[PDB]
Amino acid sequence: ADVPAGVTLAEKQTLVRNNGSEVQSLDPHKIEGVPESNISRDLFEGLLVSDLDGHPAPGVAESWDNKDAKVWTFHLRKDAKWSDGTPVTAQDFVYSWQRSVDPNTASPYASYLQYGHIAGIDEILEGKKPITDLGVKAIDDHTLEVTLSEPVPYFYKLLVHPSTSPVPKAAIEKFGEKWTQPGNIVTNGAYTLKDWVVNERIVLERSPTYWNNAKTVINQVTYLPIASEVTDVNRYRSGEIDMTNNSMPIELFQKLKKEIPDEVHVDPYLCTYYYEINNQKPPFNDVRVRTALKLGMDRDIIVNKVKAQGNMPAYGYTPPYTDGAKLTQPEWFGWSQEKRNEEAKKLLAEAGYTADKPLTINLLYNTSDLHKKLAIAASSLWKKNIGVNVKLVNQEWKTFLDTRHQGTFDVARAGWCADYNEPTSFLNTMLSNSSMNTAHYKSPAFDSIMAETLKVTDEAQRTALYTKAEQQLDKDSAIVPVYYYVNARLVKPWVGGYTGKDPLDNTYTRNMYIVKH
Numbered sequence: 292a293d294v295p296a297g298v299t300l301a302e303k304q305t306l307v308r309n310n311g312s313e314v315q316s317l318d319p320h321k322i323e324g325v326p327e328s329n330i331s332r333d334l335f336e337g338l339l340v341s342d343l344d345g346h347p348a349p350g351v352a353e354s355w356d357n358k359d360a361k362v363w364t365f366h367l368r369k370d371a372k373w374s375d376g377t378p379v380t381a382q383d384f385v386y387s388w389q390r391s392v393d394p395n396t397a398s399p400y401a402s403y404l405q406y407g408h409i410a411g412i413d414e415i416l417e418g419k420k421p422i423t424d425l426g427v428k429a430i431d432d433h434t435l436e437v438t439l440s441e442p443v444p445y446f447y448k449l450l451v452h453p454s455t456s457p458v459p460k461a462a463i464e465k466f467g468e469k470w471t472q473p474g475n476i477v478t479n480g481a482y483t484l485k486d487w488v489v490n491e492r493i494v495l496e497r498s499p500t501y502w503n504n505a506k507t508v509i510n511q512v513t514y515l516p517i518a519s520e521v522t523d524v525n526r527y528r529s530g531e532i533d534m535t536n537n538s539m540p541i542e543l544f545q546k547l548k549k550e551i552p553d554e555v556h557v558d559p560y561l562c563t564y565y566y567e568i569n570n571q572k573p574p575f576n577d578v579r580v581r582t583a584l585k586l587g588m589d590r591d592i593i594v595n596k597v598k599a600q601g602n603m604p605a606y607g608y609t610p611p612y613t614d615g616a617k618l619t620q621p622e623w624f625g626w627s628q629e630k631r632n633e634e635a636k637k638l639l640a641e642a643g644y645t646a647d648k649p650l651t652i653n654l655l656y657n658t659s660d661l662h663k664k665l666a667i668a669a670s671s672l673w674k675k676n677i678g679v680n681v682k683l684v685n686q687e688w689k690t691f692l693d694t695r696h697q698g699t700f701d702v703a704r705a706g707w708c709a710d711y712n713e714p715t716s717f718l719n720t721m722l723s724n725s726s727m728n729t730a731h732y733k734s735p736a737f738d739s740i741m742a743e744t745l746k747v748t749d750e751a752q753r754t755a756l757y758t759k760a761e762q763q764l765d766k767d768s769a770i771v772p773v774y775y776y777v778n779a780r781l782v783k784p785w786v787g788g789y790t791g792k793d794p795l796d797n798t799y800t801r802n803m804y805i806v807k808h
């Protein structure tokens with residue numbers, strides 16, 4: 292943290308914040324959700340980290356170079372240590388990245404390093420070659436060489452993501468699946484695990500072994516797993532939470548803008564709210580049925596329920612304000628809702644679903660006051676607009692994510708946040724082979740377009756190819772886009788270091804401090 296001169300720090304340097312749900316795991320290779328990453332960024336530090344403006348900055352790697360954006364050499368700082376006193380070495384990153392792509396690890400972020408296209412990754416992920424063939428090697432203890440199969444100038448932006456953090460070989464081989472237990476875990480972040488009580492709290496305490504511990508201010512941070520946005524807000528107002536989750540309850544947000552405007556932060560957020568179609572669950576294997584759902588959803592009615600936050604209606608998957616995206620709105624977005632509804636009922640009727648023989652689907656969503664309200668709305672809209680019956684199923688955050696991977700759902704409330712500020716961070720999730728493809732979308736045409744992005748001469752072509760992928764995704768109605776997120780949360784006036792200028796919202800407890808109150 293960088294405390295401004297003249298600012299008086301408080302006696303007690305503690306922070307409470309709501310994470311929004313109970314985390315999948317504290318194992319960096321066993322997570323895929325934003326809540327999981329919020330804790331991982333405090334516990335584990337990768338090669339690069341996000342600065343206050345969201346730009347890649349030095350982490351364990353103090354400098355780095357590249358040749359043709361193909362061979363990346365990372366120079367690791369020599370005072371980089373684990374929580375057991377052992378130094379963080381290039382070998383840790385070889386082991387860690389080899390583990391992440393091991394079929395036996397079964398990481399949901401297995402395909403992440405495949406977005407960087409590290410040498411020999413393709414055959415390793417499908418279990419044809421061994422993990423030791425991966426194009427990452429320890430040239431020495433403090434020098435890591437990453438060899439890629441094609442040029443990727445945005446490779447370095449990937450390396451802020453927790454699924455790219457080092458993981459301690461000793462602890463994992465000693466404790467197995469018990470390696471993240473409070474007493475056992477070994478961390479290289481600014482914090483280590485003090486306590487973990489399921490559905491109550493995760494307590495981290497400042498790790499003195501951290502190389503930059505001299506600049507850490509917050510001694511202890513608590514993450515709460517409160518799914519109810521109403522309860523989060525109420526506990527914040529009762530003075531028990533310092534920072535809410537960035538999910539605001541539809542009903543109270545207008546009240547909160549009026550009463551505590553100074554404490555209400557709303558900033559750009561590279562995430563898309565959408566209704567994810569299981570493309571392999573009948574009748575959603577039919578593109579006509581999928582298109583009927585896409586058109587039959589009224590975004591304007593839905594967006595007007597969250598108007599106070601100022602969400603823009605969504606016409607695609609990749610946020611158009613994503614760095615290197617010049618997206619075009621599809622013709623159907625320009626139509627009236629009455630015209631979308633007619634065309635949707637026609638397309639349904641072609642597939643043999645009419646008023647007389649109706650379509651009944653299950654809309655899955657993760658426990659939430661925001662998601663329940665917008666689901667009831669969406670359910671009602673689809674019923675009046677295109678005569679589709681929509682029953683609501685709710686599950687806890689962990690089960691929700693599992694259900695979508697297994698493909699045991701019809702349509703799920705979905706929300707993707709960019710891991711790095713580049714359209715591939717989104718678009719690569721819809722690749723046939725991607726471990727993050729919970730849509731189960733398989734288009735050789737879409738895969739072909741994305742493969743073409745790595746054979747490009749200038750960035751102007753790369754941007755155009757991304758727009759063609761978004762168009763193909765839209766033509767195949769892979770998803771029902773609803774609205775592009777904003778980063779809206781409540782932050783007590785005594786919490787400093789939160790600027791909200793990072794559009795990925797990759798904040799670190801080590802960057803924050805408590806002003807006297």
Ligand SMILES: NCC(=O)N[C@@H](CO)C(=O)NCCCC[C@H](N)C(=O)O
Nearest residue numbers: 311312323324325538706707708710
């Ligand atoms: N790039 C990581 C990501 O976007 N992961 C998804 C998971 O598929 C996620 O965490 N997304 C964030 C949206 C869900 C988080 C919150 N609890 C809510 O439901 O509001």
